Amino acid sequence: LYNAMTPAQRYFVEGEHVVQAEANRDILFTQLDSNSYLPVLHYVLVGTALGVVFLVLPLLIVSFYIVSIMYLLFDIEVVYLIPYVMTNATEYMYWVMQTFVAILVGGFFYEWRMGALEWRE
């Protein structure tokens, strides 16, 4: 639980009631913990514990390399494309994206022409 440590973070609210309330609080999205990934980590710990319990219970009683590289480089290209989709683009942002896509489609065309996309090898 992250806790405000300065008066400015606590909206210049005085007293010790606020500090106690903040420390003993619950993770609520409509309060002080919005867009928080702490629940996700609580979920990861619960899932791991559940698996560990199942695991322990009974005890008591060249083409592939190519596909990996192409995947990594296309994945980075898609990672670059993700910011564009998250904005309301203008005409010039559209044309920059179009140039980016053209470069990607050229690399794809190279892969197709050279026979990398075919998996006979």
Place this chain on the structure above:
Amino acid sequence: SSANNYDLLGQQHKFENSKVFEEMLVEEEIAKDRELLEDKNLAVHQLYIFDPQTQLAARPR
């Protein structure tokens, strides 16, 4: 042995000399392209495998 060897030599020389000019030129181009295609990192090598005697595309790579 000497006579038989010179018979084989004669056959080889007859074969080389008898080719017509058009064939000799074509063979000169085959040899030149064999020299150019010695490098195996060329893009064309990825596309196809070339016949050794005549550097013509034999199969896709």
